[PDB]
Design a protein around this ligand. Structure first.
Ligand code: CYC
Ligand code: CYC
Ligand code: GLU
Ligand code: GLU
Ligand code: LYS
Lengths: 161, 160, 160, 161, 160, 161, 160, 160, 161, 161, 161, 160
């Protein structure tokens, strides 16, 4: 993975360049936000189970998906689905701390669409659940942090489609 | 950076960052402006740091610039200073990242194998980097020289 | 089923089924008619088993149907009895299969994770299943209640 | 894997149903003749090495296949081939007990044709050896049990072709 | 404490502390007086923080003090507030230590196993601690509430 | 470990003897009780957490042992203590199924007194808790099974003294 | 026995016995009287089973009791029958235990190494055990001979 | 061959052949004409080596050519001598290669499983190979018999 | 391990007490001079290889110990000895930062005397080398910090004796 | 792998034949070259680092490949490249000793083109470097051994193309 | 381990000395026996199973030790005992090739008496069996080699006592 | 020695020495007189080999005998030659043993750590050993120089 700092270093290194004004501006931009990212991550960690619970209640429960024949029917599949949502929240939080989505390509999305398709996991319902996690998270961390977390939630959803 | 190190450690244990990891990130970003200032001093003075370090090195390691020496002649001496300029650039990356990982990944993994193949005495490369540390330290506060010095020391120790 | 469990155990040891496994299958198929009759008693009486089990649970744990409780209100209470009906259905599958595998695969793997997410006190779910065992036992001979009881006990123990 | 019983339970479970009259009739169909499956499996287990020995003697020995240049030449290849026949007999016996070939797709056939083709194991001669195992097995368990075992031997052969 | 955490992290990598790690310890020692003052506000107001947190919890979760609930009756309710007072005491230790280690070692390792055995709904214990955070924050500056809040959030997240 | 059957076989084998009348009487005695042992084990398994909870409430709670300075103070020590009681119940259940205490010497008691003494775990309080587990278990499995379980609980306690 | 095997498997997974393991123990103990009766027939007829098996072996393998043969002469022939009596005794232990473990632990682990060192043709030992199976089968029902036969077959196969 | 064995050993240690390995290859190829002559003498005498070895084996192991024996009758006896001729051929390959691996790869891997399936006593196969060694030795110088003998000994030892 | 702060927290925790005036005075005592500990540790870290080099030169080199027959003869033994001196300096520095020698008992001294005695590592010469490390360290960090480092060097030496 | 000796043994074995006149003449042909192969291998081993150094200097250094943006930029990539050239020289030397290229298919080339293409290692430049190794090697071992080494260098290059 | 050559090197190295005339004469003394040691080792290897068989027949068979109640009763214990005798013969042969017993201390005797005492293996019977191996070995290798092998057999026996 | 290496290899495979290993011991002891003569030539010429090797090294590496250099001045230069004399002594031990293990165990394990601590450039130590090889070679036959050379090469490569 790269974070916002290492992405700048790597783009300068491939050119054989010392950090130029544009690179330094990107580094300053990250440093100026770091404490706000830590504050959001602290709040999300303390509320991670509650965020997934509320998103599931809003987007999945009391539908064909949890009834016999639905992909969240059986305790094993219910548990697998909330485990996936726990992953999406934990990795989106990492990406927000890093200010960079590369961890999502490396550790979340690589082969994920193919896995879901092979198992019959419905992508549309997963995307609806991630949208609900985005809304619940924004209610807890405030508008600016909610928008930033939204970038990474949307990145995961796009990667499934 | 300490941000990536914290994320990699947390992911290995399938967990959110610990309060200690988050505190380390807070301390790191609060120092950001000071790190950028240190990196900018080294960047702005890069020609003099490399030139003076080269001059100091050739006095300690006369063998490398004596006939049969790896840096003998105008062209090989220029390539030697090119390498010192590479290492100064990597030291600036380490300073802004708050850890040695960019230096390790670009300039240290395989360094002994590369210089052994080229016939470059790696003790003398380490001496050149130690000379850059001493020149750079003259441009920095005691506190800033302590921070920059850790990155120079990492490179010197990896070559010794 | 006992047939699949025996095959999986034998395959894990790269062997033919043991005489013990084959005897269990012979006993299982000879007893099939009796197991279907026991399962049919639970099927035929599912309304009374679930209703009386719910009443027993809510007498012991009135907190779960009190304000703040997971089953508070008519809709949540109905969903709670729906879950007891799910577990009674799974118990009938285990009885006909002569093995808990259908119960395990449908209703036990991940059960603690599901109820933790929902905020359901799983000790109270276990109490509801224990109450269904006691109601069902009243509709069965001592011998048939012994057989059915093992399947209810499996579920109760798996929720501890 | 699935057996005859679990297939019925699963079809009821996907509908959220207690076992209905049609499901109970399918379970009774397994119970009606299940003792005959156990009796056949008991006989095969007791005679497993002898069945493979006789099948090999009838179908493979004293031919180009065991002579220099043949795919059963060298002790290593001879041993691998009789190991494969041991596998086919053991898994066909499991499938017969289960009344369901799913274990053969899951544990025998997945990638097997590709493995044989990459190594140069001749499928024609393998199918001839499985036909010999089917005939020797039928001589020991009787024609009716031999026909049921034959369903699973033929399933393996078809899976190679 | 931050000192022990820094030493344990450095020892795991067979190394001396970095200049950055030593600067974090310098900042910790210089801020010691302010951390003691924050801890003293929670200590001095412990009865009101625990009492008001209990009232908030029992308003949100009246089931836990209703018949069948783990905290039903005068004695069990008093024991529930005794546990909240334990966690407030541990939060004061974490604040003075600059690290959650005392909280983790005294009150978090094994906490789910302890409350599961007792039949205590740990989600409601977490709600009691979250209520103490909100009451304590009212007695602190925005800056001091931010610092104390991280320690309460650690406990809440460790129980979820 | 040995069970009641293997203990008899081993004592006959060391003499080079076929099973004599005394040995056959011991085997008959075990076979006559096997189903009762399985019935007790089924009940204990289903109630294992509840048995420990009631024993702890009767013997340990609301005392110096759970308050600051006591050996069950801190969540880690509380959890370690109930883990130990969970072990005692699980291993006593194995010994009762086996009709033989050898599993307790091999897997529970070897070095246990020394471990407790080195850590400062109070043996007297542990023995009181095991006595409480014996009483709660007997209430669930009935007098005869309670007495048999009591043999193995007492064996563990004696091994701590 | 299946009791010890079930306990060892459960202990390896830090768990109570599974319902399947408990059912296997119930089936095992319900067959106990029948297993004891089979073992008693072999025990009561041990002199004739060993004597007749020896005679059948020496008729099929006259080489072992001919000059140069491992069992040549009165004393060596008596030692050969002593070994067959050992294996019949172990078969009775296997029958009462409901599995081959007592046979394995006493008479099979290391058997090839022992007889190789002694210069005893182990194929002929296997023939003697196969002859005991045939003599014992004449004293048993078809069903009981099937059960006993598995234990003799285990020994014969373990020597080949 | 000795060349492949040296390369495989060197590759396992990520190294060039040792001076000792290279010297052994030089000594091996300088003696190559003598090794080829040993293989030619065994090839030219193969009928008598196999026939005499068979006679010695059947005198020591009359069971294998007696009723019930694996080699009983004209056809099975001819197949037994066919197998001894296979092993003599493989011994000539090992002699020319200066290494047992060609023998191992053709005639040893899986040999116990093959002969177990066929019902052939592998200790008697080993005896037949040991008998061929004794006949072949009579055709060779003491030094050449020592060399050939190591390859017969390899086969005999690999069947124990 | 414990540090000066955790020792106070632990003594309050075993009493079930919030930090009292006496406990707060002990914490203030650590905070009062903690920056001096950080300054000493900074200097030692920057000079760690040089401290060991000078101590070895002053106490061990050009003696019977490094010549054939001596315990530092052979490159393996020379390297093991300087590794041990590196350990003593690194752990003494940790103990000085902590203001507590507990890390030395836990991570340095447990079984060390027994290991040295079993291998024939001379304790007298080790204590002379640690004394040299103490003197070289004191020359770099100043007399007062040198005295505090000396407490931990003496703790290690006493632990060997 | 096969060598020139085992190639003859394998061709005789597939026919079920003792070594005939043609087989013995082929073995004599290999034995007559063995000392020349050992002499070449001895020279290459003594000069292995120098051969790779000169080849790299002739074919790769002071180009876009070693500068930022090139595949040999970074010490890790420079070291990986010279490690690959060390492998090609060591394995080509084995193949020359064996008088058979089979070791190159088994231990060098299996999946190598695919690995290089997936990582972005330039095959053109690699083949140019191997051509330089062939020329430098030929200068040291003389024309006949240089031609024989060239067969194996060309075999590796063809396997990359 | 050390051999007769490395014993001389080690005694010279502890003095910091090049091999002097006396040291070179000790090496010549070992080289002058090397062929005799190899001849003895060749004979023992060819007869290893027969040596152990005869020793066991002379010292252990038809006694209380092989009957029920004896330590060689059960095929597992009989096999373990002859495995131990196989070890003693193989390691004594190594020590004789080396002309030094140090391999016996390092690879055979370290903890062996304690292992035998903990398992109840009778040491007196083991020493009688080793005496029998010494006598049988001497009969095959001749008096001089028999005496030298006897040094190593006696070394093993003394190490058990 | 070659004898210990052969025993260690055989012991790792739980076997007697191979015919090839026993042959290598016979060839080793038959060549022993020649190995002892090589060791005697190096021993007898040790002062000149070390003195000339030092002069060659100090011409190639004038830095080590220049101000600031590890070997600067009469006493440090004498200690440098003392170390080359140690390595020549170890090379004689390897030659008589037919194995590098004595060299490895005395002078190679930890060598980089020892010289790093002392500030000695280990590439220059390796150069001194390479210079001793070249001086010694002139005192030996082509065959004996080949043998001695392998042991000098081992030391040089083990320091790289
Ligand atoms: C009879 C079918 C074949 C036969 C037998 C034979 N055995 C021996 C000698 C021994 N047999 C044993 C066996 C056991 N020890 C154990 O612990 C067990 C497990 C319960 C067994 C089976 C032992 C220990 C011996 C050694 C003698 C002793 O008791 O101490 C002989 C004697 C051989 C001799 O040369 O002395 C014989 C003849 N021989 C055949 O050819 C038959 C095929
Ligand atoms: C000469 C080629 C280079 C050189 C050498 C040099 N070495 C030292 C100091 C020591 N070297 C050793 C060596 C060994 N100890 C062992 O056990 C072995 C294995 C046999 C070896 C090789 C030791 C122990 C010392 C320390 C002194 C002592 O003997 O106690 C020095 C002295 C450095 C100083 O400042 O004291 C020198 C100069 N230096 C070079 O630059 C050459 C390349
Ligand atoms: N291992 C077999 C079967 C695969 C499987 O078990 O799924 C193969 O290579 O094809
Ligand atoms: N191996 C180290 C570890 C020391 C410790 O655990 O304290 C020793 O023997 O001391
Ligand atoms: N020999 C090098 C010289 C590099 C010039 C850089 N100073 C080349 O071919 O370019």
């Amino acid at each position: 993975m790269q974070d916002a700092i290492t992405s700048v270093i790597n783009s300068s290194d491939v050119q054989g360049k010392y950090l130029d004004n544009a690179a330094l501006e990107k580094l300053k931009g990250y440093f100026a936000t770091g404490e706000l990212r830590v504050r959001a991550a602290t709040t999300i960690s303390a509320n991670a189970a509650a965020i997934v619970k509320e998103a599931v209640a809003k987007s999945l429960l009391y539908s064909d998906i949890t009834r016999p024949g639905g992909n969240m029917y059986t305790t094993r599949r219910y548990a697998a689905c909330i485990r996936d949502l726990d992953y999406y929240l934990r990795y989106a939080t990492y990406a927000m701390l890093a200010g960079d989505p590369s961890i999502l390509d490396e550790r979340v999305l690589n082969g994920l669409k193919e896995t879901y398709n092979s198992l019959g996991v419905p992508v549309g319902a997963t995307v609806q659940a991630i949208q609900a996690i985005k809304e619940v998270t924004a209610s807890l961390v405030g508008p600016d942090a909610g928008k930033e977390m939204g970038v990474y939630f949307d990145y995961i959803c796009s990667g499934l489609s | 950076s300490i941000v990536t190190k914290s994320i990699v450690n947390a992911d290995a244990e399938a967990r959110y960052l610990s309060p200690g990891e988050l505190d380390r990130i807070k301390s790191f970003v609060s120092g950001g402006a000071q790190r950028l200032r240190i990196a900018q001093v080294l960047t702005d003075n890069r020609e003099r740091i490399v030139k003076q370090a080269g001059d100091q090195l050739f006095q300690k390691r006369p063998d490398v610039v004596s006939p049969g020496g790896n840096a003998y002649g105008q062209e090989m001496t220029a390539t030697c200073l090119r390498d010192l300029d590479y290492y100064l650039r990597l030291v600036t990356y380490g300073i802004v990242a708050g850890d040695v990982t960019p230096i390790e990944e670009i300039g240290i993994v395989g360094v002994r194998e590369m210089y052994k193949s080229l016939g470059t005495p790696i003790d003398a490369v380490a001496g050149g980097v130690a000379a850059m540390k001493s020149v750079a330290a003259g441009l920095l506060s005691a506190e800033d020289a302590g921070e920059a010095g850790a990155y120079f020391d990492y490179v010197v120790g990896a070559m010794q």
